[PDB]
Structures are given as structure tokens and as C-alpha cells.
Amino acid sequence: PLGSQLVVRAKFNFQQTNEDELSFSKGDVIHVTRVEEGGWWEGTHNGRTGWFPSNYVREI
Ligand SMILES: [Cl-]
Ligand SMILES: [Cl-]
Ligand SMILES: [Hg+2]
Ligand SMILES: [Hg+2]
Ligand SMILES: [Hg+2]
Numbered sequence: 001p002l003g004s005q006l007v008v009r010a011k012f013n014f015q016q017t018n019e020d021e022l023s024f025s026k027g028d029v030i031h032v033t034r035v036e037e038g039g040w041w042e043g044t045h046n047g048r049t050g051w052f053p054s055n056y057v058r059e060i
Contacts, residue, residue: 006032008043008057022050030057 016023034042
């Protein structure tokens with residue numbers, strides 16, 4: 001559970017590949033909540049929480 005206040009911006013549109021993943025549109029800002037090796041981070045956006053590809057975002 002990330003303690004710092006990391007925010008990222010989506011570089012692409014992402015359709016969740018699983019129910020536990022975050023769908024989002026290019027330009028959306030995501031608040032990172034978990035960061036695990038493997039390329040998938042967990043995050044929040046508009047009250048929704050889930051995993052997403054870390055290579056789809058740019059740290060703000
Ligand atoms: Cl969205
Ligand atoms: Cl948005
Ligand atoms: Hg992956
Ligand atoms: Hg969203
Ligand atoms: Hg939003």
C-alpha cells in the first residue's frame with residue numbers, strides 16, 4: 001500500500017483484460033496505490049480501483 005502520493009497520466013486507452021483491472025482513457029489521471037514488479041500497478045480513478053499496465057502511464 002503505497003505511502004507516497006504518486007499520480008500518473010494515461011498514454012493510451014486501456015480496456016481491462018480482467019474484472020480486477022482498471023479501464024481508462026488516454027489523458028486520464030490515476031492515483032497509484034500499489035506498485036509491484038511485473039509491470040502492473042494498482043490505482044484509482046473516479047472511485048474505481050484496479051490493476052493496470054505501468055507502461056501505459058507517465059508519472060506526473
Ligand atoms: Cl476513464
Ligand atoms: Cl479521466
Ligand atoms: Hg503484464
Ligand atoms: Hg475511471
Ligand atoms: Hg476523472
